[PDB]
C-alpha cells in the first residue's frame, strides 16, 4: 500500500522488543521502496526495503523481494566515528505466474512465516545446526 | 498508528502532588509539540499546557500557571506533567493530546486519559 | 536438529489450514535436507528444503537457505495424469559472519517472520500492491 | 485523492452490475495510478488506470488521462487456464491551461459523464451506427 | 443515430447547470459529426464532434472518437470585441474488435459515466491532485 | 439522397420477412456509400453498399454499383466466437451515357426488378436451373 | 420513417387489469428513451410515464405511480404498459412517444393511441 | 513526517500575516512533496517543496532541499482576468554526510532559523544592501 510507520512487536531471541521503521521513499529507477529504523548516525541503521514487479498486461512472472540488513557498531580506538565490524542479512524472494490466485500466494507466505517459528528453524538459524 | 496510553491517576487529597505520563507511539515523537487536555465531569473541556519541539517555548492556561510543570523526554517517549497544590477543583480526565503542524495547536490527535480527584 | 515431522498450524490466508511435511533424507552432496507433504502422486507434493553451511575452523561466512515450491494440479482431458499447471516458489537465504552472536541470528529470523504477517507484505505479496 | 477501493455502481446496458475495483498502487516510473477487478487472476482482469500531468519545459499546460481495458476470456478444451481472446479499450485524456478555474474544468467532466448516456453516442458505441 | 438536439442537463460542480448543442452537419471528408453552442460568432462556441470509423486495411478494428471543446472570453484594456483566452479540451477513443458482442460495448460506455462521478476522478480532474 | 434507415419488407423466400439496414457512413476515397443491418458481432452482417460516379462537365458513362453480400454464422466446437462459413454475393452494374434520360434509366430499374420476380430467375437462382 | 402502432384498448369495468403495446419501427428503438402519453375526453394532454434508454431510470406521475408499471422490450422493440385497479378517470387514448434526446424530454414523435375506458 | 496541513504564523515585516498549507501529494518519480495554498487558479498559488535524497552511488551525501515560490498578480488593461507578473523564489539546500549525528543536523536547522530573523539579514533581504 502507500508506506506507512511500522512497529514490529514481540520480535527478538526472548521475544520482547520492538523495531520502529520509518519510511525513506521509493527509489524511481527500480521501483524499491526503503524502510528504515530511527537510529542516529546513518551509516548504522536496521534497513528494510521491498520491492514488487509491476501490473504489466503481458507480465508473465511476479516476484517480490524482500531484503534486511542489521549492522554492528564498533567505536574503536583512536576514532571518534563507531565502525561497522559486520552485517546481518536476509533475503527473501517470492516468484509467482500470471493465472496464480490469491490464497496460492497467501499460503506460501504463511507457510514461510510458520517455518521461522518452528523449532527445525529456530535451531538451524539460531544455533547454526544443519538438519541431519 | 498514533496511539497516546496514559497513566497515573489515584484518589488524592488536596494539597498533594501527581505526575502523568502519556505513551507516544507509532510517530516520531520528537518533532511535534504535546499538550494537556482537561474534562471536567461537568463535561466541558478545558486546556492545561503545550510545550514545544524540543521543550523550548511553554505556554501555560490561568488556573495552571501557578501551581503545574510540563515536561517531556524525546528518548524514551514521554510527556509529563507534574502537579502541585491540588486546590480542590482539578477532578478531570487529562487527555494526551498530538499538537498539530502550526503555531497555535487544534489537537488532531487523543488519548484515553487518566481520572483524578 | 534431527529431523521430525512439522506440523505447521493456523497457517493460509484465513489462517486455519494445516501442513504436514514429513523428512525425506539428507542430499549426500551438497548437504540439503528434503521435506515433504504426505500427498499421493508424487509429482505434486507440498515441498520444503533447508541447507546449512557445516562449521569449519576457517569458514569465514555462514549462510542458511530455505526453499518452498507448491504445484497445482490439473486434471486435462485426455490423460489419466494429473498435470502441473505452475508453480509457486519461496527462496530465503541468510547471511551471518563468523563473529555473529546468537542474539544478532535470532533477532533477524524474528524480523522477517513478524514483517510477514505486517500488512505492508500481506499486501505487496497476496494483493501484489507495490509500496509506493 | 486516495487510492481507495472503487464500486462502480448502475454499471451495464441494463444498469443493475456492479464493477468493484481495488487499488493497485501507483508506478515510479510515471506515476499511473492502477486499478485492478476485486478477485481475479493477473492478466485476466479489468484495468483502470489515471495520471495526471504538471507542465514542464515541453508542454505548457496540465494533462489528466484516464485509460480502461477489459478482457475476454475464453476457457477452451483441454485447458485449465482461460485465454483472453479481444481487448476494449478508451482512453479520456483532458487538457487545461494553468489559468483555468475550478468550475471550467468541472464543466467538462460533468458534460462528457452526461454525453455518455445521449442517444446520440448510445448508438454510436455499443451499436457502431455513425451520426446521420 | 440521427443528428438533434442533445441537451445536456446537471452539468457543474454544483449540479444545476444546462447545455444545449444545436446539430452542425456532418463532414463528408473525413465522416465527423458536428454539434455546436448557439452563440453568433464562430470562436465563442463550446463543439462537440463524434466519429465512428470501419476497420479498414491497416486498422482492423473499429474506432470511436468524441471531442468537446470549450474556449473562454473576456475583453482587455483598448479592446471592443471579446476574444478567446482559453481552450478546455477533452478527447475520449473507444476500439473494439469484430466479435465484440454489444453488451461489451454497452459495459464501456458505462463503465467510464460512472467513473467521472467517482471521487477519485473528480478529485484529479476538478482540483489537479494525483491519486496518492 | 441522404442517407436513412431502409427497411425492406415482404423480402424471402416466403415473403414474409425483414431487413433493416442503417447507414455506415461514405467512404471518403471511393465514395462508396454503405449501409448495414444492426446485428450484434458485426463480422457477420447483412452488408448493402452503393456507387455512383460523381456528376461532373466532362464525364461520358455514368456508372451505378450495388453489392450484397450475406454471411453464416457457424459456433465451432472449441472456440467461443462464431466464424464466417460463407457468403452469398450479389454484383449489379448500371452503365448509362450523359445524353440517356431519365425513362431510358427508370425502364432499366424496373425491369431488372420485374425480370427477379418473374419464374424464369426465382428458377435460375433458387433452384439453380439453368434455362435450355 | 420514425412509426408507432400501438395495440390494447377496449371496454373493461374498474378495478380490472391491461396491457398496451407500442410497435416502434424505423429507428434504433435501445437507444431512445420512451413515454406514455394520454389525453383525456374532455380534451386535455396529460402525463403518464417515463423510461429510460435501457429501462433502469423510471419516472411516474402522481395519479400513475401506484397502480401502474411501464416496460420494454430492446430484443422485440416493444413499450408495454401494464395496469391495474382502473379508478374510472383513467379513459384516455394512451398515445406512444419517442423522447427527445435530452434530460427530461419534450415528445418529439408520436402514434396514434388505443381508446381505453 | 506524514502531510497534513502547515499553518505558518507571525510572517510578514510587521508579523501579523499568517498562511496556510494545504497538502497536495508526493510525486514517485522524484520523491518531492507538495504543499500549496487554497486557490482555484493553479497559477497563482504560493506553493512550496521538500525532499531529501538518499546517498546513491555517485553523491555520497544526504541532501535536504525545500523550495518557495511565491507569484503576485494583478490584471491589465482590456484584460479581465488576472495574471501572473513576477515570481519571488527560495532555495534552501542542506547537505549532511553518514556518520553526522542528529544534533548536528538540528543545529544546523535552529542556526538558519535564528539567522533570517538578524538585523544583518533582514536589511540585506528586505532592503537589499549589501553587508558593509
Known amino acids: 500500500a502507500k508506506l506507512e510507520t511500522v512497529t514490529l512487536g514481540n520480535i527478538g531471541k526472548d521475544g520482547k522488543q520492538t523495531l520502529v521503521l520509518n519510511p525513506r521513499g521509493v527509489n524511481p529507477t527500480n521501483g524499491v521502496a526503503s524502510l528504515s529504523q530511527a537510529g542516529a548516525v546513518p551509516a548504522l541503521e536496521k534497513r528494510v526495503t521491498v520491492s514488487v514487479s509491476q501490473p504489466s498486461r503481458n507480465r508473465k512472472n511476479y516476484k517480490v523481494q524482500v531484503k534486511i540488513q542489521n549492522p554492528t557498531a564498533c567505536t574503536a580506538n583512536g576514532s571518534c566515528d563507531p565502525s561497522v565490524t559486520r552485517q546481518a542479512y536476509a533475503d527473501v524472494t517470492f516468484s509467482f505466474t500470471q493465472y496464480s490466485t490469491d490464497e496460492e500466494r497467501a499460503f506460501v507466505r504463511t507457510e514461510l512465516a510458520a517455518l521461522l517459528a518452528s523449532p527445525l528453524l529456530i535451531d538451524a538459524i539460531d544455533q547454526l545446526n544443519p538438519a541431519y | 498508528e498514533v496511539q497516546l496510553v496514559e497513566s497515573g491517576g489515584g484518589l488524592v487529597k488536596s494539597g498533594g502532588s501527581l505526575k502523568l505520563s502519556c505513551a507516544a507511539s507509532?510517530?516520531?515523537?520528537?518533532?511535534?509539540?504535546m499538550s494537556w487536555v482537561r474534562q471536567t465531569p461537568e463535561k466541558r473541556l478545558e486546556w492545561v499546557a503545550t510545550?514545544?519541539?524540543?521543550?523550548?517555548?511553554?505556554y501555560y492556561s490561568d488556573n495552571v500557571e501557578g501551581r503545574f510543570t510540563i515536561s517531556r523526554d524525546n528518548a524514551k517517549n514521554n510527556l509529563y506533567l507534574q502537579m502541585s497544590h491540588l486546590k480542590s477543583e482539578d477532578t478531570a480526565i487529562y487527555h494526551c493530546?498530538?499538537?498539530?503542524?502550526?503555531?497555535?495547536?487544534?489537537?488532531?490527535?487523543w488519548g484515553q486519559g487518566t481520572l483524578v480527584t | 536438529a534431527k529431523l521430525e515431522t512439522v506440523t505447521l498450524g493456523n497457517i493460509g490466508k484465513d489462517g486455519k489450514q494445516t501442513l504436514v511435511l514429513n523428512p525425506r533424507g539428507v542430499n549426500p552432496t551438497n548437504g540439503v535436507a528434503s521435506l515433504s507433504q504426505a500427498g499421493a502422486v508424487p509429482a505434486l507434493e507440498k515441498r520444503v528444503t533447508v541447507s546449512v553451511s557445516q562449521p569449519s575452523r576457517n569458514r569465514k561466512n555462514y549462510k542458511v537457505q530455505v526453499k518452498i515450491q507448491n504445484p497445482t494440479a490439473c486434471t486435462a482431458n485426455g490423460s489419466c495424469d494429473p498435470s502441473v499447471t505452475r508453480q509457486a516458489y519461496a527462496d530465503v537465504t541468510f547471511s551471518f559472519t563468523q563473529y555473529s552472536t546468537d542474539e544478532e541470528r535470532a533477532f533477524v529470523r524474528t524480523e522477517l517472520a513478524a514483517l510477514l504477517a505486517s500488512p505492508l507484505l500481506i499486501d505487496a505479496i497476496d494483493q501484489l500492491n507495490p509500496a509506493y | 485523492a486516495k487510492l481507495e477501493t472503487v464500486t462502480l455502481g448502475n454499471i451495464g446496458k441494463d444498469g443493475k452490475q456492479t464493477l468493484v475495483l481495488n487499488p493497485r498502487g501507483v508506478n515510479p516510473t510515471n506515476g499511473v495510478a492502477s486499478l485492478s477487478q476485486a478477485g481475479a487472476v493477473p492478466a485476466l482482469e479489468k484495468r483502470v488506470t489515471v495520471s495526471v500531468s504538471q507542465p514542464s519545459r515541453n508542454r505548457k499546460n496540465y494533462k489528466v488521462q484516464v485509460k480502461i481495458q477489459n478482457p475476454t476470456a475464453c476457457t477452451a478444451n483441454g485447458s485449465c487456464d482461460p485465454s483472453v481472446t479481444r481487448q476494449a479499450y478508451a482512453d479520456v485524456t483532458f487538457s487545461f491551461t494553468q489559468y483555468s478555474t475550478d468550475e471550467e474544468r468541472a464543466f467538462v467532466r460533468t458534460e462528457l459523464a452526461a454525453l455518455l448516456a445521449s442517444p446520440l453516442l448510445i448508438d454510436a458505441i455499443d451499436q457502431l451506427n455513425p451520426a446521420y | 443515430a440521427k443528428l438533434e438536439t442533445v441537451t445536456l442537463g446537471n452539468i457543474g460542480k454544483d449540479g444545476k447547470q444546462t447545455l444545449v448543442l444545436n446539430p452542425r452537419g456532418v463532414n463528408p471528408t473525413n465522416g465527423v459529426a458536428s454539434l455546436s453552442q448557439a452563440g453568433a460568432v464562430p470562436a465563442l462556441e463550446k463543439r462537440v464532434t463524434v466519429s465512428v470509423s470501419q476497420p479498414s486495411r491497416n486498422r482492423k478494428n473499429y474506432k470511436v472518437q468524441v471531442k468537446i471543446q470549450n474556449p473562454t472570453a473576456c475583453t482587455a484594456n483598448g479592446s471592443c470585441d471579446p476574444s478567446v483566452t482559453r481552450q478546455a479540451y477533452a478527447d475520449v477513443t473507444f476500439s473494439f474488435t469484430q466479435y465484440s458482442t454489444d453488451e461489451e460495448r454497452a459495459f464501456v460506455r458505462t463503465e467510464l459515466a460512472a467513473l467521472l462521478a467517482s471521487p477519485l476522478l473528480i478529485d484529479a480532474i476538478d482540483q489537479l491532485n494525483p491519486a496518492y | 439522397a441522404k442517407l436513412e434507415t431502409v427497411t425492406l419488407g415482404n423480402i424471402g423466400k416466403d415473403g414474409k420477412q425483414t431487413l433493416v439496414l442503417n447507414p455506415r457512413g461514405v467512404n471518403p476515397t471511393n465514395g462508396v456509400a454503405s449501409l448495414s443491418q444492426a446485428g450484434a458481432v458485426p463480422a457477420l452482417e447483412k452488408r448493402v453498399t452503393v456507387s455512383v460516379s460523381q456528376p461532373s462537365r466532362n464525364r461520358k458513362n455514368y456508372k451505378v454499383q450495388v453489392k450484397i453480400q450475406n454471411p453464416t454464422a457457424c459456433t465451432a466446437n472449441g472456440s467461443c466466437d462464431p466464424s464466417v462459413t460463407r457468403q452469398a454475393y450479389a454484383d449489379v452494374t448500371f452503365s448509362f451515357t450523359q445524353y440517356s434520360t431519365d425513362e431510358e434509366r427508370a425502364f432499366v430499374r424496373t425491369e431488372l426488378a420485374a425480370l427477379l420476380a418473374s419464374p424464369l430467375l426465382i428458377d435460375a437462382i433458387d433452384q439453380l436451373n439453368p434455362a435450355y | 420513417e420514425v412509426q408507432l402502432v400501438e395495440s390494447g384498448g377496449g371496454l373493461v369495468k374498474s378495478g380490472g387489469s391491461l396491457k398496451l403495446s407500442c410497435?416502434?419501427?424505423?429507428?434504433?428503438?435501445?437507444?431512445?428513451?420512451?413515454?406514455?402519453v394520454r389525453q383525456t375526453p374532455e380534451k386535455r394532454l396529460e402525463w403518464?410515464?417515463?423510461?429510460?434508454?435501457?429501462?433502469?431510470?423510471?419516472?411516474?406521475?402522481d395519479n400513475v405511480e401506484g397502480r401502474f408499471t411501464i416496460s420494454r422490450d430492446n430484443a422485440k422493440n416493444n413499450l408495454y404498459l401494464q395496469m391495474s385497479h382502473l379508478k374510472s378517470e383513467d379513459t384516455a387514448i394512451?398515445?406512444?412517444?419517442?423522447?427527445?434526446?435530452?434530460?427530461?424530454?419534450?415528445?418529439?414523435?408520436?402514434?396514434?393511441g388505443t381508446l381505453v375506458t | 513526517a506524514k502531510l497534513e496541513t502547515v499553518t505558518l504564523g507571525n510572517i510578514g515585516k510587521d508579523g501579523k500575516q499568517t498562511l496556510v498549507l494545504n497538502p497536495r501529494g508526493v510525486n514517485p518519480t522524484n520523491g518531492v512533496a507538495s504543499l500549496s495554498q487554497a486557490g482555484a487558479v493553479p497559477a497563482l498559488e504560493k506553493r512550496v517543496t521538500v525532499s531529501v535524497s538518499q546517498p546513491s552511488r555517485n553523491r555520497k551525501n544526504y541532501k535536504v532541499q525545500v523550495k518557495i515560490q511565491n507569484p503576485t498578480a494583478c490584471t491589465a488593461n482590456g484584460s479581465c482576468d488576472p495574471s501572473v507578473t513576477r515570481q519571488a523564489y527560495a532555495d534552501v539546500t542542506f547537505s549532511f554526510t553518514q556518520y553526522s549525528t542528529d544534533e548536528e543536523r538540528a543545529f544546523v536547522r535552529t542556526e538558519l532559523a535564528a539567522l533570517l530573523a538578524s538585523p544583518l539579514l533582514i536589511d540585506a533581504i528586505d532592503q537589499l544592501n549589501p553587508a558593509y
Open positions: 507509532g510517530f516520531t515523537f520528537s518533532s511535534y509539540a
Open positions: 493530546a498530538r499538537d498539530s503542524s502550526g503555531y497555535f495547536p487544534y489537537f488532531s490527535y
Open positions: 510545550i514545544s519541539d524540543g521543550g523550548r517555548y511553554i
